[PDB]
Amino acid sequence: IIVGYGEWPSYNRFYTLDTKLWEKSSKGWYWKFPDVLTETGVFGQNAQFHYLYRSGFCIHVQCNASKFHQGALLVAVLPEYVIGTVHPPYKQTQPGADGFELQHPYVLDAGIPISQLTVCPHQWINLRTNNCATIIVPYINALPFDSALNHCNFGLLVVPISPLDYDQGATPVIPITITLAPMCSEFAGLR
Amino acid sequence: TAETTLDSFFSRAGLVGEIDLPGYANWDIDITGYAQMRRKVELFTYMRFDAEFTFVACTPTGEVVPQLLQYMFVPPGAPKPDSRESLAWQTATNPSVFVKLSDPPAQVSVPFMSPASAYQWFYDGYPEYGAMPNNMMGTFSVRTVGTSKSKYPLVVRIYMRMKHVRAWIPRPMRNQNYLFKANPNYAGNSIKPTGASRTA
Amino acid sequence: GFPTELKPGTNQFLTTDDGVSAPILPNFHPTPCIHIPGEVRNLLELCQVETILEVNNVPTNATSLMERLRFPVSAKGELCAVFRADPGRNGPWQSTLLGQLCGYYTQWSGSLEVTFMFTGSFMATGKMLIAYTPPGGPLPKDRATAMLGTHVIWDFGLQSSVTLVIPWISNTTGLVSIWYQTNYVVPIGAPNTAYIIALAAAQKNFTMKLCKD
Amino acid sequence: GFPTELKPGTNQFLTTDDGVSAPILPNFHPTPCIHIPGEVRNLLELCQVETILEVNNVPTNATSLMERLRFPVSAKGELCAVFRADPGRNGPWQSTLLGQLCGYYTQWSGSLEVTFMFTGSFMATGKMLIAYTPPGGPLPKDRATAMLGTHVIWDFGLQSSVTLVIPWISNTTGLVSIWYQTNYVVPIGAPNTAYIIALAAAQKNFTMKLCKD
Amino acid sequence: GFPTELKPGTNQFLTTDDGVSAPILPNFHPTPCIHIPGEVRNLLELCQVETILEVNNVPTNATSLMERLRFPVSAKGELCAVFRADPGRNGPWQSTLLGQLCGYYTQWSGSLEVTFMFTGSFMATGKMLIAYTPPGGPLPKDRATAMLGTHVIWDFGLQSSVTLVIPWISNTTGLVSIWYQTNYVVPIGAPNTAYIIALAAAQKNFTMKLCKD
């Protein structure tokens, strides 16, 4: 496990999002947190009927690939990941539990280099080394509580650093599974 | 190690904004006024610092004239002056400084103004997207003391130095050219590599 | 009263002077600071994080800038890639955060640490030679003289990532070259080209001086 | 003599500076202060006093300005009155001393305490629903959803005054609505209309910052 | 505030004033100093080293300036050389480091120490009289009165170097003359001319005052 910034979240089940099909032309995907869980589940039922909110997260990413596929994935959390357009639309700014595709993974839709993401809590998914990457992120904000609907704490970025390669005949799509479990969640202001 | 501390990294007062009075002007406090300092502050996500401001006023030719000036600081939430005789000038809750151009430059200190616990440079949400609401430090308004029109043209330079800098959540440094002061968008068609290239 | 005289250098404004000035709001209490996780106090902590080193900074095309993060290894005693151990000067080290922070300072000195990551099929095997030449030495003419210096023999059938530690740098610079010790051997049904990712960082003894914009 | 230099920021006049100045009458003795009863040291004491909240700020006529201090209750599941829990913004809270002192400051935060007083005949009975909706929530569509939130059921046949405590406010705001739980029942010979007086105050944890004229 | 008045002599710039001024780089750390061998703290150490005294400052020709470092002794009661014991004034003492540093000061006082070195064949023998005359005394008319004063009888068949200590000098000056006590006797096959080298220095009690460019 990677404990983000060395702090365990302080003061509740696994959620499985849609699988993402990693291909030869894939550029990357990003999910906005906790907006990814607002629309779905009992957790998202509290988010839309409460004023304030605070919670950590336990993001777990898995890739199901054989021994004849190759590639590397960089999974990293970026607190306050603001999008920079070539204003963004709503669907691009806060995509639901379906992420969005990066059009410019080099600048990461924010004018910042992909090469320097390792300064953030991250793990490498190398298909010949491991298929799992789990990151424990605490609550990060300037205030103890914040609105879950109008503000995203961080954005989980999953970018193919090296393209997926395979021989013709093998499965051309590698599913990517993300399982996130809210940890030390709090709510207030029942509306 | 003592060289690379945050205080040393963010010391060395830099020119933030120049004011021309060829009879008053408002200058909203903005650290980004220093041209090369935005890319330095964006390297973290949160900040908490106190600022020292220095006002060096002179004519466009740099010559020093015997004129009285008033710089008033309106804290966040206060209304701005709309003319040279507005009632906002005499308000006691907007601190002022009266200094002649002969005296050494005025030097005032402004503490941490944000209602939050840190200045945040990226808002991943709405209060219009990306509008960090509680990052407003205040405003500095400059006018020449007097009712009639002043006899000299003035240029006012502002130098700001942060003390007691604290930072959080480091992030990758900007590599693309900046386009707008508020949102971080770039030029997609004219996208460039981080550095130089070679042939092999 | 108390007799004093103004020494030379009064009424001057030194933009580096750290004298305490009068508060504009004496009665103001700023909001007390809370514990935000991940507080940084020294930039050396941000210099000691591994970061992608664009060794393959050949392409400049807009739709293929992403190909610079890694350099290919595919199908004997040949030269794969070569780059200088120069964090601050122009070149591949511009991409890493250490090489970007070196542009904010004038002098730096210490030990580097550059790791490589192999991104091939699990059934792919082979060996590669990573040699470092001290400052002044030219690029070796072949693997025979490349092995004589400081080097590591990296086989990626067993270990997928190796670390090469640059002994010492300061602001001629050292050279790092990578050689095909053995050809690229792969089974039937596995991709015939692979990639290597270079992650560069600084050791605990790296320091900087003379901050410069 | 003792060597000093004038640092930048001398000969300036900061209107907030608290430096001690020379007395104009050094030999004067001001008359010693006596104990006058009712000395106030902190304005929070003046903020913690209950004060009439003009919920019924509909009329503006000169001869009927006195009708704003109370709102009528007279002759089932209807809406009596609604007001925002916003001490500083324009509205009913302008009348109370807390809401007037909020205009002298920029930021405030804490818990309120709004009490109601029923001013009907002793033989008059009935029930009324006082619901508070957290910030963001809209006005309830009916008493059925008004009861689900935070509320008190106020019957004035037994108790003539009730207190509703607003949990927390800061500078969207909360809503307070009052509903007819049951109709107004009165005996023969007693007046068929009554009035309710709202007295609003601040708890012990209310504070203000950034004084502003 | 604290009452002071500017005493006369303020806002002046005295080029000899040693007042501490504001650093231009407060956050700079200069590189720590290492132990370089041969550290000098007082110039008197550099004054206490023996140094060639060009007694034979007769020639000025470009190709023969090297002949001034020594004066010849070759083939009875005659005068060899004479020079003044004046480190600072113009003359032979300009060549020594003591006599060059005396030009940077106005006043000096103490004891000198002038040694001679004979540079003849090992089989060459003879005697020479080195007499010192106190200040005021004229040059002696002959060796008979030269011996009566302070003198040493130097024979170089036994000892090849002798030291003459000047008692005391200050800024009339003393005289040092060298006489042929006996003729120059040499065997067959050895050179018939020899040379003497004068090495002059200062004792431990030499001091200087009033530094002057």
In order, the DSSP letters of B174-187 are: P-SPP--SSS----
Nearest to D16 among C7, C17, C24 (CB): C24
Q: Which residue has the tokens 């060289």?
A: B3
* Helix/strand/coil percent split, chain B, to 5: 5, 35, 55
Bridge partners of residue B19, in order along the sequence: B156
Chain D partners within 8 Å of E1 (Cβ): 19-20
Nearest to D17 among C3, C17, C22 (CB): C22
Q: Is the CB of residue C190 less than 8 Å from the CB of residue C124?
A: yes
* Helix/strand/coil percent split, chain C, to 5: 15, 35, 50
CA distance E211 to chain C (A): 25
Chains E and B touch (3+ CB pairs under 8 A): yes
Structure determined by? cryo-EM
Chain B partners within 8 Å of C92 (Cβ): 195
Q: Determine whether the interchain pair A70/C160 forms a contact, defined as Cβ–Cβ distance below 8 Å.
A: no
The CA-based dihedral angle spanning residues E10, E12, E14, E20, taken in that order and rounded to the nearest 10 degrees: 60
Q: Does residue C66 sit in helix, strand or coil?
A: helix
Q: In chain B, which residue's Cα lies nearest the Cα of C92?
A: B195
Q: Does residue B12 sit in helix, strand or coil?
A: coil
Torsion sign (Cα): D1, D7, D11, D16? negative
Give the domain D1-213 fold: Jelly Rolls (2.60.120)
Range list of H helices, B27-123: 38-41
Q: How far is Cα A180 from Cα A43, in angstroms, rounded to an integer? A: 12
Range list of H helices, A73-165: 90-93
Q: In chain A, which residue's Cα lies nearest the Cα of D137?
A: A191
Q: How far is Cα C108 from Cα C90, in angstroms, rounded to an integer? A: 15
Asked if D157 reaches chain A (Cβ–Cβ under 8 Å), the answer is no
Q: Does residue D69 sit in helix, strand or coil?
A: helix
Q: Determine whether the interchain pair B112/C30 forms a contact, defined as Cβ–Cβ distance below 8 Å.
A: yes
Q: How far is Cα C118 from Cα C194, in angstroms, rounded to an integer? A: 8
Chains C and E touch (3+ CB pairs under 8 A): yes
Q: Is the CB of residue E181 less than 8 Å from the CB of residue E80?
A: no
Q: Determine whether the interchain pair A142/B186 forms a contact, defined as Cβ–Cβ distance below 8 Å.
A: no
Q: How far is Cα A128 from Cα A115, in angstroms, rounded to an integer? A: 22
- What Rg do the C-alpha atoms of chain A give, in angstroms? 17
Q: How far is Cα E85 from Cα B173, in angstroms, rounded to an integer? A: 74
Q: How far is Cα B8 from Cα D54, in angstroms, rounded to an integer? A: 56
Measured in whole angstroms, the distance separating CA E111 from the mean position of its chain's CA atoms is 11
- Testing the interface with B: which of E24, E27, E28, E31 to mutate, by most B Cβ within 10 A? E27
Q: Determine whether the interchain pair C211/E27 forms a contact, defined as Cβ–Cβ distance below 8 Å.
A: yes
Nearest to A119 among B118, B126, B171 (CB): B171
**Which residues, in sequence order, are CB contacts of D40 under 8 Å at separation 6+?**
D46
Q: What are phi and psi of D118, to 5 degrees?
A: -90, 135
Q: In chain D, which residue's Cα lies nearest the Cα of B71?
A: D14
Asked if A145 reaches chain D (Cβ–Cβ under 8 Å), the answer is no
B172: DSSP letter: P
Q: Determine whether the interchain pair C18/E26 forms a contact, defined as Cβ–Cβ distance below 8 Å.
A: yes
> Residue B56: which H helix or E strand, with range?
strand B44-58
Torsion sign (Cα): E19, E20, E24, E29? positive
> Residue B108: which H helix or E strand, with range?
strand B106-110
**Which residues, in sequence order, are CB contacts of E83 under 8 Å at separation 6+?**
E53, E55, E91, E92, E93, E175, E176
Residues of D with CB under 8 A from a CB of E: 1, 3, 19-20
Q: What is the resolution of this structure in A?
A: 3.2
Q: How far is Cα C206 from Cα C87, in angstroms, rounded to an integer? A: 11
A180: DSSP letter: E
> Residue A132: which H helix or E strand, with range?
strand A132-137
Domain count, chain B: 1
Q: In chain E, which residue's Cα lies nearest the Cα of C107?
A: E31
Q: Determine whether the interchain pair D18/C26 forms a contact, defined as Cβ–Cβ distance below 8 Å.
A: yes
Q: In chain D, which residue's Cα lies nearest the Cα of E19?
A: D3
Q: Determine whether the interchain pair A142/B174 forms a contact, defined as Cβ–Cβ distance below 8 Å.
A: no
Chain D partners within 8 Å of B99 (Cβ): 11-13
Asked if C40 reaches chain B (Cβ–Cβ under 8 Å), the answer is yes
Torsion sign (Cα): E98, E99, E104, E105? positive
Q: Is the CB of residue E177 less than 8 Å from the CB of residue E81?
A: yes
Q: How far is Cα B99 from Cα B130, in angstroms, rounded to an integer? A: 39
**Which residues, in sequence order, are CB contacts of A83 under 8 Å at separation 6+?**
A92, A93, A109, A110
Query: Which amino acid would we find at residue E199?
Result: L
**Which residues, in sequence order, are CB contacts of E84 under 8 Å at separation 6+?**
E91, E92, E93, E173, E174, E175, E176
Q: How far is Cα B134 from Cα B116, in angstroms, rounded to an integer? A: 7
**Which residues, in sequence order, are CB contacts of A87 under 8 Å at separation 6+?**
B128, B129, B130, B183
For residue B42, give the CATH number of its domain.
2.60.120.20
Q: In CATH, what class is A2-190?
A: mainly beta
Q: In chain C, which residue's Cα lies nearest the Cα of E21?
A: C9
Structure tokens at E10: 């303020």
**Half-sphere CA count of B166, side-chain side, radius 13 A:** 14
Range list of H helices, chain A: 35-38, 41-48, 90-93
> CA nearest E72: which of E62, E64, E84, E80?
E80
Bridge partners of residue C139, in order along the sequence: none
Chain D partners within 8 Å of B160 (Cβ): none
CA distances from D68 to C32, D121, E12 (A): 41, 21, 75
> CA nearest D209: which of D111, D104, D112, D98?
D104
Exposure letters B155-185 (e unless 16+ CB within 10 A, then b):
bbebbbbbeebbbbbbbbbbbbeeeeeebbb
Q: Is the CB of residue D143 less than 8 Å from the CB of residue D77?
A: yes
Q: Is the CB of residue A96 less than 8 Å from the CB of residue B198?
A: no
- Testing the interface with B: which of C6, C17, C43, C94 to mutate, by most B Cβ within 10 A? C43
Q: Determine whether the interchain pair A152/B116 forms a contact, defined as Cβ–Cβ distance below 8 Å.
A: no
Ramachandran class of C149: left when φ > 0, alpha when ψ lies in -120 to 50, beta otherwise? beta
Q: In chain C, which residue's Cα lies nearest the Cα of E8?
A: C5
Q: In chain C, which residue's Cα lies nearest the Cα of B191?
A: C62
Asked if D133 reaches chain A (Cβ–Cβ under 8 Å), the answer is yes
- Testing the interface with A: which of B119, B185, B190, B191 to mutate, by most A Cβ within 10 A? B185
**Which residues, in sequence order, are CB contacts of A36 under 8 Å at separation 6+?**
A17, A95, A96, A97, A99, A156, A180
Q: In chain C, which residue's Cα lies nearest the Cα of E11?
A: C6
Q: Determine whether the interchain pair B75/D212 forms a contact, defined as Cβ–Cβ distance below 8 Å.
A: yes
Q: How far is Cα A164 from Cα A70, in angstroms, rounded to an integer? A: 6
The CA-based dihedral angle spanning residues C163, C167, C168, C169, taken in that order and rounded to the nearest 10 degrees: -50
Q: In chain B, which residue's Cα lies nearest the Cα of E24?
A: B12
Q: How far is Cα D149 from Cα D177, in angstroms, rounded to an integer? A: 11
Nearest to E29 among B3, B7, B11 (CB): B3
Is residue B127 reached through a cis peptide bond, with omega within 30 degrees of 0 on the bond before it?
A: no
Q: How far is Cα E18 from Cα C167, in angstroms, rounded to an integer? A: 45
- Could you list the beta-strand ranges (E) of C65-147: 71-74, 79-84, 105-110, 112-118, 127-133
Structure tokens at B36: 């090369």
Asked if D13 reaches chain B (Cβ–Cβ under 8 Å), the answer is yes
Nearest to D8 among B98, B104, B115 (CB): B104
Q: How far is Cα E21 from Cα A44, in angstroms, rounded to an integer? A: 64
Q: How far is Cα C51 from Cα C200, in angstroms, rounded to an integer? A: 5
Bridge partners of residue D112, in order along the sequence: D202
> Residue B168: which H helix or E strand, with range?
strand B154-170
Q: Determine whether the interchain pair B188/A152 forms a contact, defined as Cβ–Cβ distance below 8 Å.
A: no
Question: How many pairs of residues across A and D have Cβ atoms under 8 Å apart?
Answer: 14
Query: What number of other Cβ atoms are within 10 A of residue E172's Cβ?
Result: 9
Q: Is the CB of residue A159 less than 8 Å from the CB of residue A74?
A: yes
Burial class (CB in 10 A: 0-12, 13-18, 19+), C95: buried
Chain B partners within 8 Å of D213 (Cβ): 91-93
Q: Structural domain boundaries of chain A?
A: 2-190
User: Residue B125: which domain range?
Assistant: 6-170
Q: Determine whether the interchain pair C2/D7 forms a contact, defined as Cβ–Cβ distance below 8 Å.
A: no
CA distances from A51 to A110, A186, A191, B126, C198 (A): 29, 11, 7, 15, 46
Q: Is the CB of residue C72 less than 8 Å from the CB of residue C191?
A: no
Nearest to B124 among A5, A81, A116 (CB): A81
